[PDB]
Structures are given as structure tokens and as C-alpha cells.
Amino acid sequence: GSHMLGGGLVEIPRAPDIDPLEALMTNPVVPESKRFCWNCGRPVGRSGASEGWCPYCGSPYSFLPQLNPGDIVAGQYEVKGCIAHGGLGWIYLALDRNVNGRPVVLKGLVHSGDAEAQAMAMAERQFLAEVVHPSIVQIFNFVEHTDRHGDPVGYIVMEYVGGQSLKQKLPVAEAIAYLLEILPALSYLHSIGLVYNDLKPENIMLTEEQLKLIDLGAVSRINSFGYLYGTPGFQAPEIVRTGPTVATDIYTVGRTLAALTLDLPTRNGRYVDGLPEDDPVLKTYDSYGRLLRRAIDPDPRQRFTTAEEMSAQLTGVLREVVAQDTGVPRPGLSTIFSPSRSTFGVDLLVAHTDVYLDGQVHAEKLTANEIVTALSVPLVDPTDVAASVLQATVLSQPVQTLDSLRAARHGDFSESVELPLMEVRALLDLGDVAKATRKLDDLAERVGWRWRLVWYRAVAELLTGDYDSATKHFTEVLDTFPGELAPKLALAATAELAGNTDEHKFYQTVWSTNDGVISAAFGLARARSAEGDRVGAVRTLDEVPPTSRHFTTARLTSAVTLLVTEEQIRDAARRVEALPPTEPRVLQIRALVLGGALDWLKDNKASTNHILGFPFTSHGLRLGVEASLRSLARVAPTQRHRYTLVDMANKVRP
Numbered sequence: 079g080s081h082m083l084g085g086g087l088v089e090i091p092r093a094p095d096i097d098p099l100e101a102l103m104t105n106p107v108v109p110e111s112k113r114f115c116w117n118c119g120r121p122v123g124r125s126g127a128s129e130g131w132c133p134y135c136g137s138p139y140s141f142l143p144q145l146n147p148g149d150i151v152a153g154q155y156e157v158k159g160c161i162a163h164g165g166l167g168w169i170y171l172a173l174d175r176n177v178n179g180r181p182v183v184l185k186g187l188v189h190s191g192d193a194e195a196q197a198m199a200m201a202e203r204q205f206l207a208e209v210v211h212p213s214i215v216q217i218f219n220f221v222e223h224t225d226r227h228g229d230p231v232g233y234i235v236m237e238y239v240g241g242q243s244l245k246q247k248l249p250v251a252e253a254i255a256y257l258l259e260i261l262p263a264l265s266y267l268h269s270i271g272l273v274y275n276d277l278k279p280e281n282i283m284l285t286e287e288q289l290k291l292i293d294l295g296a297v298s299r300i301n302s303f304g305y306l307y308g309t310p311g312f313q314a315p316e317i318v319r320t321g322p323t324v325a326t327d328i329y330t331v332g333r334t335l336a337a338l339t340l341d342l343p344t345r346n347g348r349y350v351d352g353l354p355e356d357d358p359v360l361k362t363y364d365s366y367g368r369l370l371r372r373a374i375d376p377d378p379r380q381r382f383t384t385a386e387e388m389s390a391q392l393t394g395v396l397r398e399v400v401a402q403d404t405g406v407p408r409p410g411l412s413t414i415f416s417p418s419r420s421t422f423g424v425d426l427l428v429a430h431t432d433v434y435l436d437g438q439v440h441a442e443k444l445t446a447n448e449i450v451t452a453l454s455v456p457l458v459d460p461t462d463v464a465a466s467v468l469q470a471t472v473l474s475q476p477v478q479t480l481d482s483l484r485a486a487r488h489g490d491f492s493e494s495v496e497l498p499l500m501e502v503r504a505l506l507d508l509g510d511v512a513k514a515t516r517k518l519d520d521l522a523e524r525v526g527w528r529w530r531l532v533w534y535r536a537v538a539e540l541l542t543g544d545y546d547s548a549t550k551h552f553t554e555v556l557d558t559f560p561g562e563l564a565p566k567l568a569l570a571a572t573a574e575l576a577g578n579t580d581e582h583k584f585y586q587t588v589w590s591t592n593d594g595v596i597s598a599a600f601g602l603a604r605a606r607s608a609e610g611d612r613v614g615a616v617r618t619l620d621e622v623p624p625t626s627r628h629f630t631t632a633r634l635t636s637a638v639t640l641l642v643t644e645e646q647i648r649d650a651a652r653r654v655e656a657l658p659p660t661e662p663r664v665l666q667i668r669a670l671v672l673g674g675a676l677d678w679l680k681d682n683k684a685s686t687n688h689i690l691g692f693p694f695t696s697h698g699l700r701l702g703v704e705a706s707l708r709s710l711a712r713v714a715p716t717q718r719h720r721y722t723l724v725d726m727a728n729k730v731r732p
């Protein structure tokens with residue numbers, strides 16, 4: 079079978095797992111090329127010695143196995159050899175005498191230390207044998223071995239995991255999938271007051287069954303003091319100031335993701351900080367880049383607050399990534415925002431054609447008010463005091479909402495942030511932007527500009543026509559939740575109001591990911607039409623699901639955007655053809671299509687025998703146009719417009 083990762087968005091073929099015997103290295107040696115100081119990262123023992131001290135920092139190093147095949151540690155562990163190497167030295171395979179010679183793994187605890195440092199390292203880590211999780215290697219024992227120098231050396235005894243480490247660059251979907259699998263391990267550690275500290279490709283292993291974290295050597299308590307473990311290039315800059323935190327583990331996830339996916343520059347053996355400036359991976363996957371930047375923010379307060387919170391955003395990002403590279407949408411229900419409450423801009427394009435019916439000016443433009451009422455809203459925090467009354471209010475229109483909340487307010491909700499935020503939502507839905515902003519600004523003076531306040535500020539700035547600030551503030555929210563589609567839709571709609579070309583292609587990203595977001599289909603189509611791609615716009619509009627009440631509109635919209643070859647005129651006719659005279663706007667678009675095909679025959683010849691039921695001759699099209707106009711004349715809501723259509727009918731008449 080295959081690993082079903084990312085909730086089945088990423089399938090990875092299972093490989094059987096390396097048997098102890100096959101894992102053993104014949105001649106364990108670190109080649110000169112690969113000799114580096116574990117402490118400062120610099121080249122060490124080069125021509126060229128296998129053991130010595132680093133000339134740069136003074137740290138002792140050894141590239142020689144400390145246990146040899148044949149050895150017996152603590153009268154219990156029968157050593158067979160080395161299966162791997164890292165910063166703390168060789169990794170040893172032993173057979174466990176006290177459990178039928180089960181294979182176990184031994185690794186050193188410290189790099190150097192007197193007998194006390196050695197015992198202390200063991201004593202301080204003994205608690206790890208109570209850290210239990212399915213995605214975490216098991217610790218079996220702590221063991222002391224007297225070496226050649228007569229010195230006690232401490233070892234940790236672990237489960238053998240014969241998988242494949244994640245350590246030349248993974249596709250981003252794959253890497254996200256892997257990290258999604260171990261984040262629950264990190265959440266688990268956090269819930270018990272532990273930090274993993276040393277997350278990196280090396281420490282994550284794909285086995286036949288699962289993903290495992292295979293090294294617990296750096297695990298410590300939150301805010302702990304003493305030696306802080308981790309690896310420069312992956313570990314949080316502030317770790318000496320703050321000590322280990324959830325925040326510091328979040329940093330290592332971002333770093334780990336970057337390391338697995340990007341061409342990160344190195345100085346020493348170490349990855350340099352931040353992200354490469356114009357990386358092609360980050361260009362193709364916009365939200366993946368934003369996710370990375372939040373996770374690795376130099377300010378720990380600006381990173382994801384929890385591993386679970388990060389996991390939700392990373393899932394959203396994965397959906398965006400997979401949808402883009404497969405061409406198949408991956409819808410999901412947000413943990414942050416509501417689903418869209420409505421659609422906007424669906425009948426802009428076809429409302430223009432309404433002139434055929436009524437004779438009225440129809441120059442419909444996308445409006446802030448239509449967008450505002452359609453936008454997703456932030457989910458209410460259930461720990462807020464008003465959460466019960468707000469859940470009761472959920473089906474209430476804007477004015478009824480305001481009334482219920484103000485009544486509820488007048489008789490303890492003094493401290494509530496969500497009650498006022500709901501009043502703002504409602505006032506904005508009604509157009510009372512001035513009242514809303516007063517209310518927001520007051521609230522921001524009590525609790526500051528928390529992200530929900532910034533969201534509703536951006537919305538207000540939409541109604542105000544201050545599109546630059548709206549973009550700025552929606553972006554802040556996006557960068558806080560890069561895996562959410564709500565903020566991307568809001569930014570695509572703002573760009574439209576502002577008359578900017580959206581260089582981030584938010585409509586496309588939104589629609590690619592979730593073909594339930596019909597606003598995005600029409601938005602995306604309008605952008606493709608704008609740059610001469612009438613083919614892509616129709617392509618986009620074709621993806622509108624037939625289950626939607628907007629399907630017919632999307633079909634008629636295609637006809638309209640198509641009007642230039644004969645095959646395009648046929649495409650346009652084909653979309654109109656299927657729809658009954660019952661459906662609103664059909665008659666006028668029929669007229670428009672036959673009209674287009676008439677103007678076409680002035681400069682072209684048909685190799686088809688009909689458009690819309692009429693002969694594809696000048697005579698047939700004129701007859702078709704005529705008949706369409708006379709039919710529109712009979713439903714024209716004014717006698718003045720009736721005369722207009724009749725006149726046009728007489729004129730076009732063959």
C-alpha cells in the first residue's frame with residue numbers, strides 16, 4: 079500500500095524497512111570531506127586527524143566509533159556495529175539480552191564530560207522514558223560504559239527504526255505532508271511542557287508504517303535553563319534570551335520546511351538565516367512562502383501560537399499547493415473564517431446586455447457593498463463572554479442583530495470583544511461605515527488592533543474607497559493565516575475595485591483550490607478577458623458546477639465574453655442553445671449571438687449550416703436577429719423601448 083499523507087492529498091509508496099543486519103556499516107568511517115566541528119560547524123581534522131580538538135573553538139571531536147563490534151555495554155547490550163553518524167557521533171546497533179536479543183540503538187549523551195557531567199546528563203534525561211507517542215522513538219534505558227581511558231561514558235538506548243531519514247530537494251506537497259504528520263507529536267510534547275528543540279530533516283524518518291521523530295536527545299522543559307540544544311541554521315535566534323518555548327519549536331518547523339524544499343545558501347555547513355530573496359519555489363507557491371516567513375519570524379510573538387494552529391494553516395497551504403499542481407480543487411472548511419456568505423460580481427458582465435430588454439443604461443460596476451455582504455467573516459472565539467448570545471443571533475439580519483445585541487448589552491458583557499465586533503460586522507453590512515469605525519477605534523483603544531479588528535478595518539476601508547489601506551490590512555491578515563482563502567478573495571476584490579492588475583493572482587488561487595467559490599470564477603474570468611485571453615475566461619467559466627444556480631449565468635457570460643473565429647461563434651451559440659426561453663437573459667443573449675454571427679458574415683464564410691436554429695446565411699441570421707428583436711419587443715417593459723426594438727427589427731429584416 080501507499081502512505082496516505084496530508085489527509086490523502088499526498089500518496090507516498092511504502093518501502094519495507096531496513097533490517098538490522100543490512101543497516102550495519104562494514105567500514106564506518108567519516109571521510110575527510112565530511113569532517114566538521116559539531117559545535118562551530120567549521121572544517122576540522124583536515125590534511126589530517128580523526129580525533130583532536132577544534133583549533134577554532136576548542137571543542138573535542140572524534141570521528142572514531144567508541145563502541146566496537148563484539149563489545150557488551152552494561153552487561154546487557156551486545157554491540158554489532160554502526161548504522162549511522164551525526165553530531166554526537168556514531169549510532170550503534172546492539173542486541174538486547176534482557177528482551178530476547180531485540181535490536182536496540184545506542185547513542186552518546188554528551189560530547190565530553192567528567193564522570194559527574196556524564197551521570198548528570200543521564201539523571202536529567204531519565205524523564206524521557208515516560209515520553210510516549212506513536213510518532214516518537216521509544217527510549218528503553220540509560221546506560222554507563224567505562225571506556226579505554228577508564229572513564230564512564232553515558233549512552234541512551236532506543237528502539238531501532240529502520241526507516242529513511244528526510245535528509246536533493248523534495249517537492250513542496252511532499253514536504254508539507256511529512257511535517258503535517260509530526261506536528262501532532264510536537265503538540266503532544268508541548269501539552270506536557272516539553273520542547274523538541276532539534277527538529278531537522280536528519281531527525282525525521284519515514285518508516286513503512288509512519289513518520290517518526292527519532293532523536294529525543296535535545297528534548298527539554300519550556301523556559302528551562304542550562305545547556306540549550308539544537309543546531310545553528312535551524313534553531314531560533316532568541317533561544318538564549320527566552321529559553322526553549324513553543325515559539326522556538328515553531329521556528330524549527332519553518333526552517334525544516336525551507337531546508338527540505340529550497341536552495342538555501344550555506345556559510346560553514348550552516349544554512350543562513352531568512353529565505354533566499356527571489357526563490358522560484360516561493361514564486362510558484364505564494365501562500366507557502368508566507369507560511370514559512372511567519373513560522374521563522376525573528377520575533378517569537380509573530381509566529382504561529384501553537385503547533386495545532388500552524389497545522390491548520392499548513393493544511394490549507396497544502397490544499398493550495400496540490401490543487402495548483404494537479405489541476406483538481408481541494409476544498410476544505412476553514413477553522414478561522416466562515417464560508418462565503420454570498421457571491422459578488424456574478425452578473426456584472428451579462429447585466430450590461432439587459433439594455434436589449436429595457437433600454438436602460440446598464441453600466442454595472444463591481445461595488446464594495448456587494449463584496450462586503452458576501453465576504454467570509456471571522457469565527458467567534460467560543461471563550462468570549464458573549465459567545466452564547468452571538469450563536470443565538472446567527473440567523474438574524476443586520477438590524478435585528480444590532481437590536482438584540484444592544485438590548486442584551488443594556489441588561490455582564492462589559493469585557494466582551496466579540497459582541498462589539500459583531501456590531502461592527504452588522505453596521506458594515508448596512509453601510510454605516512462611520513458608526514462602524516468609531517466602534518472599532520474605541521474597541522482598539524481597549525484591546526489593541528487584534529487581527530479581527532484589522533479584518534473589519536480593511537472591510538471598512540473598502541466601503542470608504544481607501545483601497546491602499548484595505549490591501550495593507552487584508553494582507554496583514556493573510557500573512558497571519560496564509561492557508562486561508564477568505565483573505566485572498568478579499569484582496570482579489572480590492573485589486574479590482576482599485577483598478578489594479580493582481581500580480582498575486584488571488585482569484586486564480588482561490589478558484590483553483592475551491593470550485594465552490596463562484597465569485598472567484600467570475601473574478602478570474604474578468605481578469606483573463608481584460609488581457610485578451612477570452613479563451614481562458616471561458617475555460618474558467620466552464621468549471622462552474624452545474625449544481626449552482628449561477629451555472630446558467632456563467633454559460634451566458636461565456637457567450638458574452640466570446641464576442642474572432644467561426645468556431646468561437648459556434649462556442650458562443652452552443653452555450654446559449656441548451657437554455658430554454660424560460661430562463662432570464664436567454665432571449666437577449668440569443669439576439670446578441672445571432673447579431674455577432676451576422677456581423678461576422680460580412681467578412682467571412684460559414685462551413686456550418688446553422689446558428690441557434692437559423693440558417694447560417696445572411697438571410698437566416700437577419701431572420702434570426704429580427705425574430706429575436708420582435709420577441710424582445712413583446713416583453714419590453716416600456717412602449718418607448720417597444721418602438722426601439724420594432725424599428726431595429728424592421729431594419730435588420732431580410
Ligand SMILES: NC(=O)c1c(NC(=O)C2CC2)sc2c1CCCC2
Binds near residue numbers: 169183240241
Ligand atoms: N533509532 C534509530 O534507529 C536511529 C537510526 N536508524 C537508522 O539509521 C536506520 C538504519 C537506517 S539513525 C538515528 C537513530 C536514533 C538517533 C538519531 C540517529
Ligand SMILES: [Cl-]
Binds near residue numbers: 150151222224
Ligand atoms: Cl559497561
